[PDB]
Amino acid sequence: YRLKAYYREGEKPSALRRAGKLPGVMYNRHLNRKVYVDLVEFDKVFRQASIHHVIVLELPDGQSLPTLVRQVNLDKRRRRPEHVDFFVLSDEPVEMYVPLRFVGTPAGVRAGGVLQEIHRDILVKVSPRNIPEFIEVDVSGLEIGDSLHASDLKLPPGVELAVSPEETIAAVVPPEDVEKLAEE
Amino acid sequence: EVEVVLKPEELRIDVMRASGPGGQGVNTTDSAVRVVHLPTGITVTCQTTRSQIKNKELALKILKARLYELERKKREEELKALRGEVRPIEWGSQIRSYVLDKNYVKDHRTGLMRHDPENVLDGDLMDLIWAGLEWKAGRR
Amino acid sequence: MLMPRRMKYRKQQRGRLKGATKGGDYVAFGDYGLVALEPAWITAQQIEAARVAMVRHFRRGGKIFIRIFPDKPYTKKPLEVRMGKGKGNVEGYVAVVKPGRVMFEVAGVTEEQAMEALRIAGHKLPIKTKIVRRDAYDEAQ
Amino acid sequence: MKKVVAVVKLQLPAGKATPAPPVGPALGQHGANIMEFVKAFNAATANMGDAIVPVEITIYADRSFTFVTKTPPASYLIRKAAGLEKGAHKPGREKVGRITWEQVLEIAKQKMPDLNTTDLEAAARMIAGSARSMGVEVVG
Amino acid sequence: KVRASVKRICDKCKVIRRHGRVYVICENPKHKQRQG
RNA sequence: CAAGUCUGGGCUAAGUGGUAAAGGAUGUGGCGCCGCGAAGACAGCCAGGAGGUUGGCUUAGAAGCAGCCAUCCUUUAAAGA
RNA sequence: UCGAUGUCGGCUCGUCGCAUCCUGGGGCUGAAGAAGGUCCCAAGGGUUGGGCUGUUCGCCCAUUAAAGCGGCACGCGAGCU
Ligand SMILES: [Mg+2]
Ligand SMILES: [Mg+2]
Ligand SMILES: [Mg+2]
Ligand SMILES: [Mg+2]
Ligand SMILES: [Mg+2]
Ligand SMILES: [Mg+2]
Ligand SMILES: [Mg+2]
Ligand SMILES: [Mg+2]
Ligand SMILES: [Mg+2]
Ligand SMILES: [Mg+2]
Ligand SMILES: [Mg+2]
Ligand SMILES: [Mg+2]
Ligand SMILES: [Mg+2]
Ligand SMILES: [Mg+2]
Ligand SMILES: [Mg+2]
Ligand SMILES: [Mg+2]
Ligand SMILES: [Mg+2]
Ligand SMILES: [Zn+2]
């Protein structure tokens, strides 16, 4: 989606972040500038968005650039962001973990069981013009115990990932039975 | 199982002043302790040492005892009437009479008088118990 | 209980608690998490009690993630004993928790159940907590 | 379902019904008799066939009533199509029965009245719900 | 009745605050509370 | 008790100030983005408040209303296994 | 505090706290009544005589409206024992 962005002169990090503006830097394999992009829209957007969908960055130069965030460092105590790294793009092929939907009902949901979508945002190598969305997987076959994984999925033409393919992407495990207690 | 967790939930622990010798402290410290068991009426005391905390636990180390003995003395009387009473083994109190002489079995409880004694001594008991599960469970 | 199978050393120095969790600050597993707001030593008997409290709450249901582990030993001298004569004996183990740490996580459970769940588990913890969702807690890369 | 202020709705047996086991006396607490709903009752059950007859009652306080007979509950009528006797201690995906597509339209010739819709298909998709109640499969 | 953590029990329970103290009014009595 | 009952702008109603924690609370004042506002309920007030079905199971009973499980469909203005 | 601050219990004399054993008020109650249970307000005044033991404490006898718990150098030996 879109979003306003401004140029940072490099002045009072911890202050420009208190005044309301969120610090950051945009770089790629060529240039790299320092900027400040307010929490207001950033937040609102970033959550709906994430690091999957691209964003615009109109500076006082107008120069709107296509990017995906590479690094967002929190604030530890009390969740909040202190910084963000912007990877500008083009037609240049790069990576990015692509969202994951799992239409289906494992056989692991009739006599006790729940889906643990392990790697629910898989990383794939590919260019801009090649940026999908809800890259669903099938779950209609996940038995209670044994469960899917690796890159054994529907990778639409152009999806040249970077898994194993073994990297367990997801699994289905049992519930929390009241029946417990022990010792000895 | 073998368990008895007397939670300090029904105990009354006191701490009177030491008795006997001592010194400037036998008069001053609440050494002597007394743990009381209320649902029973048992009381254990202790002045063996010169500390209340080494005496209330050492005085408990006994109540656990006596109890397991008087809490078990029951298991002896509570299980000695569940079994029944018949067992004198004297002449004149048989449930079933077995005879190899003339060869036959005389179930005295029923009134039945089988003729196969030697045959019964092989486990064949369906039938005397067939009648036994009647005379017995027939009065209740 | 919930201690470690083996250890190179049985008793270890107390230490300290400088704020900031260092690590463990984002969700990364379940859907809702319980994050510590005050620093503290959480005894395994608490971690335990809290856990049981959750499964008990939504009996026969989702999955629970215990994000902390009591590997630090707790020493305690006997009663009525004076100072010195060596370090006490280990009475249990505790996990050190700092502000920002996500202690627990839950999954495959309704948002109602999740909240209620963690709210009960925090009533078993020696500190103050906060319940969270998921969003920037995606350090996948 | 009928009127109120003195009514009761049950699902009587089939063939015989006079004692107290099923509901023989339950209708008497709210006002009833023994000679009005036993023989002078099975006139309908002798027609409905057997199994279950969801016929109910309505009291007036003078041995009178509106014995409006009904069609076997969609809970039972499904055990005929599949075969099972109960249904399932717990429904879901597993069930000791089966019901093909037109298997649900076999009852379409049964349940047509008070369902709400006169037709067979706009009223059959209701019983497809009792196949998610007892468990009974739906071959397809 | 009198406790430190006073809350609404049933749907009909109401939280009044009279004379500086936090109370709980409700249809049925057993639910009455006065913080303290 | 020596020197401002000094100036401008806020907050608190507890004598807080002039001790204390978990944890409670339509206390107040101020920022937030969401509901959803002539398919004009926000509250009262007027009528509704349905059918298979009492869901199956369980069970003396479980008829929305112990509990295990499923939570689809029919009729309209509306109505949940 | 060792160029000395007499230590248990008893007796005598009390006085104070309330986290109340009676008695007065009161809300819940699984409060029919009578009698209880539990919590709230409230010390103004009361809070027995014996057997045993140095005992404190306890157990027991006989009563009672009740036979409260604690502080005061576990109150009180220039007051006694
Ligand atoms: Mg001596
Ligand atoms: Mg002393
Ligand atoms: Mg990392
Ligand atoms: Mg002056
Ligand atoms: Mg002034
Ligand atoms: Mg305060
Ligand atoms: Mg506070
Ligand atoms: Mg607070
Ligand atoms: Mg001295
Ligand atoms: Mg001197
Ligand atoms: Mg006194
Ligand atoms: Mg009365
Ligand atoms: Mg009081
Ligand atoms: Mg002392
Ligand atoms: Mg003294
Ligand atoms: Mg003297
Ligand atoms: Mg003196
Ligand atoms: Zn209420």
CATH number of the domain where residue D29 is located = 3.30.1550.10
Please classify residue D19 by burial: count the beta carbons closer than 10 Å to its beta carbon, then call 0-12 exposed, 13-18 middle and 19+ buried.
exposed
| Resolution of the coordinates, Å | 3.1
Interface of C with A (CB under 8 A): 19-21, 25-26, 52, 54-56, 58-64, 99-100, 107-109, 132, 135-138, 140-141
User: Looking at the domain assignment, is residue C20 inside a domain?
Assistant: no
The span from the CA of A71 to the CA of A95, in Å, is 14
Chain C residues lying within 8 Å of B53, measured CB to CB: 79-80
Q: Are residues D65 and D91 in the same domain?
A: no
Task: Out of D70, D85, D101, pick the residue that ends a domain.
Answer: D70
- What domain range includes position C79? 29-137
3-state secondary structure of C64: strand
**Chains in contact with A via at least 3 Cβ–Cβ pairs below 8 Å:** C, D
Q: How far is CA C60 from the centre of its chain?
A: 23
Residues 63-82 on C with a CB inside 8 Å of B are: 79-80
The span from the CA of C100 to the CA of A76, in Å, is 5
* Closest of D137, D134, D138 to residue D91, by C-alpha: D134
The span from the CA of D13 to the CA of D24, in Å, is 11
Task: Out of D47, D70, D93, pick the residue that ends a domain.
Answer: D70
Q: Are residues D93 and D40 in the same domain?
A: no
Please classify residue A132 by burial: count the beta carbons closer than 10 Å to its beta carbon, then call 0-12 exposed, 13-18 middle and 19+ buried.
middle
* Closest of C126, C103, C102, C41 to residue A78, by C-alpha: C102
CA of residue B29 to C1' of nucleotide G11, angstroms: 23
**Which tokens belong to A111?**
């006599």
**Which tokens belong to C37?**
């707001």
Nearest CA in chain C to A42: C136
User: Looking at the domain assignment, is residue C19 inside a domain?
Assistant: no
Task: Out of D70, D99, D127, pick the residue that ends a domain.
Answer: D70
The span from the CA of A139 to the CA of A118, in Å, is 13
Q: Are residues D111 and D59 in the same domain?
A: no
Q: Cβ–Cβ of C58/A176 closer than 8 Å?
A: yes
Q: Are residues D18 and D41 in the same domain?
A: yes
Name the DSSP letter for residue E29.
G
Chain A residues lying within 8 Å of C62, measured CB to CB: 114, 175-176
Q: Are residues D2 and D66 in the same domain?
A: yes
Q: In Å, what is the CA distance from D104 to each residue of A28, D93, D131?
A: 64, 18, 9
Name the DSSP letter for residue D116.
S
**Cβ atoms B18, B26 nearer than 8 A:** yes
User: Looking at the domain assignment, is residue C121 inside a domain?
Assistant: yes
Helices (H), chain D: 26-29, 42-48, 77-82
Q: Are residues D52 and D63 in the same domain?
A: yes
CB atoms near residue B12 (< 10 Å) = 11
Q: Are residues D115 and D93 in the same domain?
A: yes
The span from the CA of A96 to the CA of A171, in Å, is 22
Please classify residue D135 by burial: count the beta carbons closer than 10 Å to its beta carbon, then call 0-12 exposed, 13-18 middle and 19+ buried.
buried
3-state secondary structure of C131: strand
Q: Are residues D40 and D96 in the same domain?
A: no
Q: Are residues D79 and D124 in the same domain?
A: yes
Q: Cβ–Cβ of C20/A76 closer than 8 Å?
A: yes
3-state secondary structure of C115: helix
Q: Are residues D39 and D82 in the same domain?
A: no
Helices (H), chain C: 44-57, 111-121
Q: Are residues D3 and D62 in the same domain?
A: yes
**Which tokens belong to A120?**
């629910």
User: Looking at the domain assignment, is residue C22 inside a domain?
Assistant: no
**Cβ atoms A153, A103 nearer than 8 A:** no
Q: Which residues pair with B26 in a beta bridge?
A: none
Q: In Å, what is the CA distance from A64 to each residue of A35, A39, C114?
A: 14, 19, 42
Chain A residues lying within 8 Å of D94, measured CB to CB: 110
- Residue with CA nearest to F76's C1' atom: D116
CB atoms near residue D104 (< 10 Å) = 23
**Cβ atoms B97, B105 nearer than 8 A:** yes
Does A touch C (3+ CB pairs < 8 Å)? yes
* Core vs surface per residue B23-36: b (16+ CB within 10 A) or e: eeebeeeebbbbbb
**Chains in contact with D via at least 3 Cβ–Cβ pairs below 8 Å:** A
Q: Bin C97: left if φ > 0, else alpha if -120 < ψ < 50, else beta.
A: beta
**Cβ atoms A22, A42 nearer than 8 A:** yes
* Closest of A138, A130, A176, A10 to residue C56, by C-alpha: A176
- Total domains in chain C come to 1
- Total domains in chain D come to 2
**Which tokens belong to B129?**
């118990």
- What domain range includes position D97? 71-139
CATH number, residue C121: 3.90.1170.10
The set of residues, in sequence order, having a beta carbon less than 8 Å from that of C108 and lying 6+ positions away, is A114, A115, A116, A175, C61, C62, C63
Please classify residue C35 by burial: count the beta carbons closer than 10 Å to its beta carbon, then call 0-12 exposed, 13-18 middle and 19+ buried.
buried
Query: How far is the alpha carbon of C83 from chain B, nearest alpha carbon, in Å?
Result: 17
- Which H/E stretch holds residue C63? strand C63-66
CA of residue C123 to C1' of nucleotide F22, angstroms: 9
- Which H/E stretch holds residue B105? strand B104-107
The verdict on A110 touching D (C-beta cutoff 8 Å) is yes
**Cβ atoms D5, D44 nearer than 8 A:** no
* Closest of A61, A63, A90, A85 to residue A72, by C-alpha: A85
Whether CB of B38 is under 7 Å from strand G: the answer is no
* Closest of C99, C90, C104, C109 to residue C132, by C-alpha: C104
How big, in percent rounded to 5, are the helix, strand and coil portions of chain A?
A: 10, 25, 65
| Most A CBs within 10 Å, among D89, D90, D93, D132, to test the A interface | D93
Beta strands in chain A (DSSP E): 6-7, 23-27, 32-36, 67-73, 83-88, 97-99, 114-116, 121-125, 160-161, 171-173
**Cβ atoms A175, C58 nearer than 8 A:** no
**Side chain identity at residue D133, one-letter code:** S
* Closest of B66, B45, B65, B71 to residue B56, by C-alpha: B45
Chain C residues lying within 8 Å of A180, measured CB to CB: 52, 55
**Cβ atoms D95, D84 nearer than 8 A:** yes
What is the radius of gyration, based on Cα positions, of chain D?
A: 17
The span from the CA of D76 to the CA of D79, in Å, is 5
Number of H helices, E strands in chain A: 2, 10
**Which tokens belong to C29?**
């597993």
Q: Are residues D89 and D104 in the same domain?
A: yes
The set of residues, in sequence order, having a beta carbon less than 8 Å from that of B101 and lying 6+ positions away, is none
